[PDB]
Amino acid sequence: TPLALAASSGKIGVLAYILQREIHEPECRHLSRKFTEWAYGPVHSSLYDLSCIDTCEKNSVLEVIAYSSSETPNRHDMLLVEPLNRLLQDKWDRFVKRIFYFNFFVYCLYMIIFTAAAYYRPVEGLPPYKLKNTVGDYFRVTGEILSVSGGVYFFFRGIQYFLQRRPSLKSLFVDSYSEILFFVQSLFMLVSVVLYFSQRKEYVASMVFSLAMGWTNMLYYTRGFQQMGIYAVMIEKMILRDLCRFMFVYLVFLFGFSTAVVTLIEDGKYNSLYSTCLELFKFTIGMGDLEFTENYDFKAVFIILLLAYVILTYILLLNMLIALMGETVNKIAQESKNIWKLQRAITILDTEKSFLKCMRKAFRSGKLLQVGFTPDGKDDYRWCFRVDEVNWTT
Amino acid sequence: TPLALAASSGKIGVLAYILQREIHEPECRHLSRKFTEWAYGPVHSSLYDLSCIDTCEKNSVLEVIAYSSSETPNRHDMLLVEPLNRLLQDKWDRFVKRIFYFNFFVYCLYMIIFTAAAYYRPVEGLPPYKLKNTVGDYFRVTGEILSVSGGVYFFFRGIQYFLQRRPSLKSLFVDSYSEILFFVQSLFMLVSVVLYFSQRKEYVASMVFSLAMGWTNMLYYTRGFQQMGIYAVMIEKMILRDLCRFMFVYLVFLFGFSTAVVTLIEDGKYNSLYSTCLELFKFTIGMGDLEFTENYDFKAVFIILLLAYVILTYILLLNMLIALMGETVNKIAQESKNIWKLQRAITILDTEKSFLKCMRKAFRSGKLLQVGFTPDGKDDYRWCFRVDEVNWTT
Amino acid sequence: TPLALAASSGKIGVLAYILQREIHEPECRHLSRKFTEWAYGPVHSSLYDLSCIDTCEKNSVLEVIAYSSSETPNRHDMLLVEPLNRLLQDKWDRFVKRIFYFNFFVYCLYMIIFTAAAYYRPVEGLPPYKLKNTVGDYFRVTGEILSVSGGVYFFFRGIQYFLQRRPSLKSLFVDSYSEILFFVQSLFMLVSVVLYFSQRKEYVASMVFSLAMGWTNMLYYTRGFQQMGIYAVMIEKMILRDLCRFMFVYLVFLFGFSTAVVTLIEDGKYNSLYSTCLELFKFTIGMGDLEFTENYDFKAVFIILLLAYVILTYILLLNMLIALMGETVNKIAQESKNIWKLQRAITILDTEKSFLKCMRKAFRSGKLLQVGFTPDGKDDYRWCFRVDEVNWTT
Amino acid sequence: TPLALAASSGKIGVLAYILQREIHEPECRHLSRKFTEWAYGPVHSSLYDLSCIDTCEKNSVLEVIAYSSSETPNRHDMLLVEPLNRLLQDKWDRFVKRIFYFNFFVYCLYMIIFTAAAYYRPVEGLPPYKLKNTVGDYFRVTGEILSVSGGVYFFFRGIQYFLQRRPSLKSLFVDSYSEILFFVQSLFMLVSVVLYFSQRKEYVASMVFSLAMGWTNMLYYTRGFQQMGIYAVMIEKMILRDLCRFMFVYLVFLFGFSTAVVTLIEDGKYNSLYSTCLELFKFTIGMGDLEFTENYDFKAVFIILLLAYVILTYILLLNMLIALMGETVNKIAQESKNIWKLQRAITILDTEKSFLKCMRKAFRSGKLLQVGFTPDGKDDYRWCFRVDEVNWTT
Numbered sequence A, B, C, D: 001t002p003l004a005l006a007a008s009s010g011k012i013g014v015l016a017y018i019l020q021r022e023i024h025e026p027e028c029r030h031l032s033r034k035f036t037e038w039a040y041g042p043v044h045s046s047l048y049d050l051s052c053i054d055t056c057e058k059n060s061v062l063e064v065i066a067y068s069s070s071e072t073p074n075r076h077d078m079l080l081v082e083p084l085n086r087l088l089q090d091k092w093d094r095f096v097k098r099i100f101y102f103n104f105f106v107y108c109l110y111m112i113i114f115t116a117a118a119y120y121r122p123v124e125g126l127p128p129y130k131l132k133n134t135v136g137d138y139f140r141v142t143g144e145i146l147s148v149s150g151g152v153y154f155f156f157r158g159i160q161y162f163l164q165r166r167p168s169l170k171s172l173f174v175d176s177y178s179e180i181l182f183f184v185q186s187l188f189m190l191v192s193v194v195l196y197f198s199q200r201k202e203y204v205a206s207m208v209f210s211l212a213m214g215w216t217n218m219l220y221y222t223r224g225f226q227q228m229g230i231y232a233v234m235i236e237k238m239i240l241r242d243l244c245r246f247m248f249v250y251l252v253f254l255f256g257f258s259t260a261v262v263t264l265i266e267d268g269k270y271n272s273l274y275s276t277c278l279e280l281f282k283f284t285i286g287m288g289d290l291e292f293t294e295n296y297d298f299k300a301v302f303i304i305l306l307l308a309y310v311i312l313t314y315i316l317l318l319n320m321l322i323a324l325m326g327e328t329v330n331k332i333a334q335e336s337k338n339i340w341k342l343q344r345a346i347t348i349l350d351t352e353k354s355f356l357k358c359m360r361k362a363f364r365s366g367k368l369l370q371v372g373f374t375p376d377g378k379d380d381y382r383w384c385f386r387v388d389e390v391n392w393t394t
C-alpha cells in the first residue's frame, strides 16, 4: 500500500497526513481517518480507523516500521506519530509490561541456576561424570540440564528469528545486535555440551564464554526501564563506534612498541612477543612497570621507548578517548532516546507473534465503530477504531 | 487560600500577580499588595502587605513552598519572586546566619569529640569497661557520654522532623535526603550503645559506621556558603542519578566475569567467588593484576576474559561515566543553583520553628502600616508591611 | 593566471565565480565555464571547461590548492567547490582507490617482514654475521635485505618529495608532517645498516627506532577511510598543540620537585637526579610510591613535597588535560574533517605524478566538447569538458 | 580626572568616547582627541593626543587600569580600546620584548645555579662548612652565594612592590598572585641562610621549599607567549577555584573514612591515624591496596568501608572533578585570554618604572604635533600624538 510504502521508505510527513486525515462531508467521512467524535470541552477525544496494527492487516504498518533495514530516513521518528505513539504506550502499560517483567524474572533465574551449576562443577578429570548418590549433586545435575535447556531455547528462538527476517549479514550486526548475543551465548552452551560428552576437558572453555556472555545479556532487559534503557543504548553505540576506531589506533602503538622492545631485549623471560605485549598493556591499566627488565644493552633506548609509549598512549590516547566520547555523547544524547523508543516497539510486536494462542487482547482500544456513514451504505459496525484523548491548547 | 493554592500547585506567574498587585483608588488601595510609598528618584522603595511569612498566618506561604512534594511545576522558582527573594536574604544576613554558624561550630566540635572517643577506645576484650582512676580516661568517658548525647539529640530531632511532615517513604529519599543521614548516623550510634552494654564486641562495627556517616554529614553545612553549597548539591544529584544507573551496569560486568573466572579456576586460593570478585575489582582502581593466578587449564581462556573485562569496564565504562557526568553537568549547572536556594530557605524556616521562645526577630522589616485607607475605615495601623528598595532602570 | 592567483591566495568566492560562470550568448558561450547542456527534468546535468586539472595546464589549479603554505585564508574550503569536489571523488572511486589499497597492502607486508627480520636477529656478538647454511636464516637474510630496500625507497622518495617543493623548514613540520616520519624511519634504517657493517652492536638502537616509527606510520593509510581518517587527524593536531604546551608545564613541575627531592635525599640509591625523576614520573602512570625511600632527614618535608606534587600534577594537571582536549575537540570537530578532505586530495595528485607512464586515465570525465560555438570559429572539439549531474531543488 | 575616574571605575564606553572624540571646527579641534590627519585611500591613519601613557601624566591612565582592585566592572576590557590596544603592542614588539626575554634568560640561569648548588651540598653534619682547597667546591661556594643574591633581590623587589601599592591582604592573593610566590621563594631562601649559620641541619628543609617554589615560578614567564600564557592563566584560575572547593570535599571523605578505619584496626602498624591516612590516600593515586591489613575483627566492616570509600571518592569525586573543570573551562575560555592581555600590560608598565634611567624610548610613537590649531593660539608643537593606522572597511 502507499501507506506502507510511505512507512517502508521513511517518508515522515506523508504518514502524518495519512493517519490523521479529516473529512466531515457526505460520501467522504468514510474516506476520513481521524474521527473527532467527542469534540467536547478542551479535551478533544478522537478515534482512529486503525488499519495500522498487525491484527488488522497482513504485512501491516508497525511490523514495517520496526523491521526496517535502518537505512531509511527516520525510522526512529515514525513511531512518534500520534496514533501509534500512544497505541504502543497503551499496549505496554496494559498488556506486555506484565509479560516482559516475567521473562526477565525467568532469565534472572536462568542465569543463577547456570551460575551455580558451573560454580560447583567437579574437579576430577575425564568428563562426563557419574552422578553420586548423595542428595547434593542431584541439584547439580538438574542445574546442568536446566541450563542446557536454555541453550536449546535460545538456539531455536535465535534461528526462528533469523529464519523469518534474514537481515543478510550487513543489517545483522547493524541493527539486530543484542539478538545475536543470545544466539552466540546459546551457541557456546551447545559446544560445551558436545565436548562434555566427547570426554575432553576443554568444554569448560565453552561453558565460561557462555556464562560471561550470559550475564552481560542481562543488559537486554534494561529496555522497559527508560532510565536504564536509554543509558544502555549509549553503551551499545559507543562500542560499535569507539572500539572499531579506537582499538585500531591503540593496537598500532601497542604492537608497534611491543615489537620494538622485544628486539631490544636480548634474552630472558620477556624475550617473547606475548610476554612483553602484556607488560606494555599493563601501562594502560595503571600497573605498568618502567624497570620491568634489565637484560638488554642500551638502557637509554629502552626507557625512551617506554616513555615514548606512555606519553603517546597513556596520557594522550586515553585522554583523547574521554574527549571524543563526550563530544559524541551530545550528538547521541537525543538520538539514543529515539533508539530506545523503537527497541521497546520491537518487543511489543514480538510478543503478539508469541502470545497469539491467547489473542483476546490482540486488538487495541476498540473494534466496534466510529463512522456510521459510507457512500456504499452503512458504516456503523466497521473501521475498528482506537479511542484516544487530547489536551487543551486553549 | 487561593494564594496558598497557587503556591502549593506551583503556578508561578499567578503568585507573581498576587504578591505585587497595585491599586491607587478609593476602596481599592486596601485591595492592593505592592505599596510604592516612596516613588522618589530612581530607587523605588516599596512596601509589601506580607501575609506570606509564617509569623503572620497559620499554614502560611513559605512553609507551603518549602515543604512541597517536589512533584510541583517549579518549586525552585517560586522563591525567586521579589518580595520573598529578599525577605529570606534579609532574614539570613540579619538573623539566622549567626545561629547557623553556631550549630556548625557545635557540630564540628561534636565530631572531634566523637572522633577522639573512638580513637582511644580500649583494646581489651569484653565490653563494657571499668573506668580507670587515672585522669586520662575520664576524658574518654566524658567523650563517650557526650557523643551518645548527640546520638540522642539527632534521634528525636530526626523523629520530630518526620512526626510533622510524614513524607510517606517516596518523597523521603527524594527531597529530604541529607536529613535521613543524620537520623541514620544517630541510629548506628544507639545500636552501638546497645551492644556496648550487652557485652558483645560487635558494637564497634556500629560505632564505625556512625562515625564515617558522621563526618560525611559535615557536608550538610556547605549550604550557607554559595560557593561550596551549589557544589555539594551536584554531589547529591550525581549519586541519586549516576549510581543507581551506573552501578547496575558495572555490577553486571563485574559479577558476570567474576563468575566466569571462578569456574575456570580449578582449585587454590582464588577458587571462591568473593576472593576473585576483589581481584577483578582491583582493575577498576588501578591495581589489577593480569597474572594473579596460575592454577587453571586454558591460559588463553583466562586472559581473554581479563582482557574482555578490562576493555569493557576499565577503558570503556569508566570513560563513559566521565562523559555522562559532563553531559549531565550542564543540565544541572543552573538547576542545582536553584536547589541550593531552596535548601537555604528550609534552614531559615526550620530555625523559627526552633527559636520561637525568643521571637522578637520573628517579624521581618516592619509591622506598623503602609495603607492608611480602607473601605471599612482606617488602615493606618495594619498590614504589617515589608520595606523594600529598588534600582534605577532609567 | 588570475584563476590560479585566486586559488594561491585563497580567495574563496572568486574561485566559485570563475569555475561556474554561465553565458548563453553569441561570441560569449566560448567565454562561459559551466555548460548546462542537459537541463532536463529535475536532474541538471552540466559540463565544465576544465583547465583546472593538472593534465590540462602546467602549474595547474589542484596542485596550487594542494601544495599551499597553509597560511592561506581557507585552503581547506577551496576543495569544496562543485567542479573539483566531485572530480576528486570521481578520480578516487574510479582510479586511485585501487592503487591506494595496493600500497597499504604492500606496506603492511613491508612491516611484517621488517618485524620478523628484527625479531629473529642473532644474539651473538660482533656484527655482521655469517649466514648459516641452514634453510632458516636464508629467510632472515632475505628479510634483512628486503627491509633495507624499503629504507632505500623511502629515502629517495622522501628526498624527491623535498627536492620538488622545498617547504623551507617552517612549513615542513607544519603541514607536511607524516611525510617527515617516513623519511625519519628510513633514516634510522640506514644508520642501522652503517653500524651493522661497521661492526658495532649499537645498530640495534637504530633498528628499533626505525621499527617503532614504522608501525606508527601505518596510521598514514587511515586516510582513505573517512571514519578512521578524520579520527587520525585529531591525533595529529592534539600532538602539535597539546604536547608543546602541556609537556612544558609538566616538565616544570616534574623537574622542579624532582630536584627538590634529590637534595633532601642524603645518600643511597635514589640520590641521583635520574633515579628519582623516574620515581616521580611513576605517579603520573599510577605506580607512584609514597614511601619509596627512607634515607633522609625531615620526613614531613619529604611527604609534603610528594603530596604537593601529586595534588598539582596528578589530580590537577592530568585532569586539566582532559578538559582542554575536550574544549579543543569541538573547535577541531569540523575543521579536522576539512583537513582530511585535503589530505586525500594530495594522495590523488601524488599518484598521477607517479603513475604517469600509464596516463590513459589521467583525463577525467570527458575530453571531446561541450561548446560548439566560438567568436573565432568552431568550438565543437575542444574545452575537454567534465560531465556532471545534479539534484532536484524543486 | 574624569578620564581617570572613568577608568578607575571601569566605565567602558565612556572611555571609548573620550579617547576617540573628533572635531573639525575652529576653537574645537583643540578639544578633539582622534586626529584623522591622513584620511587617504582605505587605510585611515590617525593620531591620538595621548595624555594616557604614564610618561605624560602623573597618576596616568594605564597605571590606573592595570593596578585596579579587580572589583571593577571590566578591567579586562578597557585595554581593548583602540589607542591603548596597539600602544602596548607597539611598546612590546619595539621595546620590552627584548628586555623581557633577558630576565627570563637570567632567571633560567638563576635556577640552574641554585639547582646545582643544592644538588652538590655536603653530606657531613654540623653546618656551616669549611670550603675545601680543591677547585671543585669553589664553584659550590660561588653557586651558594649567587643563589642567596637572588633571594636578596626578590626580597626587596617583593617589598618595594608592596611598599607601593599595598593591596591590603584581600586583593593580595586575589590579583597579585604569582608575585607573592617570588616573595615566598625568597623568604624560604633567607630562612635557609639563617639556619645555615645557626648551625642547625634543618636549613635544607627551607632550601628545598625555596627550590620547588623556584622552578614552578618559571611559569611566570609564560606570559609573553600567548600560546603558553593563556594556558598558564587557566592553571591559576583552576587552583584558586577548584582546590578550595574540591579539596574540602575530598578531605571530608578522606579524614572521615580514615578515622573510621583506625578505630576498627585493633593494633599493629596502621593503628595510627597518619599511617592509614596515607593508605587511603593511595587509592586516589592508583596504588590503593584493599587487603593492606588483617589485624582487626569484622572483615566485612573493613571492606565495606574501603568499598564505600573507593566508590565515593575514586570513581565518583575524581570523575566529578573532570566534569566540573570542563564545564568551567568554556566559561574561562574567553575570559582567561583577557586576563593574559592584562598581565602583559603590567609587565610593560613595570619595566618603565624600572628602566627609567634610560627613558629615551619612554615616549611612544610621536611627540611633535598633530593639532596646529587652538583657540588660545598656536598648537603645532604640542599634544604628543601617537601615529596609528587602519583597515579598509570599504
Ligand SMILES: Oc1cc2c(cc1O)CN(C(=S)NCCc1ccc(Cl)cc1)CCC2
Binding pocket: A177, A178, A179, A181, A209, A212, A213, A216, A217, A218, A219, A220, A232, A235, A236, B304, B305, B308, B312
Ligand atoms: O542491548 C544489549 C547491550 C549489551 C549487551 C547485550 C545487549 O543485548 C551485552 N554486551 C556484551 S556481553 N559485550 C561483550 C561481548 C563479549 C562478552 C564476553 C566475551 Cl568473552 C567476549 C565478548 C555488550 C553491550 C551491553
Ligand SMILES: Oc1cc2c(cc1O)CN(C(=S)NCCc1ccc(Cl)cc1)CCC2
Binding pocket: B177, B178, B179, B181, B209, B212, B213, B216, B217, B218, B219, B220, B232, B235, B236, D304, D305, D308, D312
Ligand atoms: O547534603 C548532604 C550531602 C552529603 C552528605 C550529607 C548531606 O546532608 C554525605 N553523603 C554521604 S555520607 N554519602 C555516603 C553515605 C554512606 C557513608 C558511609 C557508609 Cl559506610 C555508607 C554510606 C553523601 C553526599 C554528601
Ligand SMILES: Oc1cc2c(cc1O)CN(C(=S)NCCc1ccc(Cl)cc1)CCC2
Binding pocket: A304, A305, A308, A312, C177, C178, C179, C181, C209, C212, C213, C216, C217, C218, C219, C220, C232, C235, C236
Ligand atoms: O598522519 C600520521 C599520523 C600519525 C603518525 C604518522 C602519520 O603520517 C604516527 N605518529 C607517531 S609515530 N608519533 C610518534 C613519533 C615517535 C615514535 C617513536 C619514537 Cl621512539 C619517537 C617518536 C604520530 C601521529 C600518528
Ligand SMILES: Oc1cc2c(cc1O)CN(C(=S)NCCc1ccc(Cl)cc1)CCC2
Binding pocket: C304, C305, C308, C312, D177, D178, D179, D181, D209, D212, D213, D216, D217, D219, D220, D232, D235, D236
Ligand atoms: O603565574 C604563575 C603561575 C604558576 C606559578 C607561579 C606563577 O607566577 C607556580 N605555581 C606553583 S609553584 N604552585 C605551587 C605552590 C607550592 C609549591 C610548592 C610547595 Cl612545597 C608548596 C606550594 C602555581 C601555578 C603556576
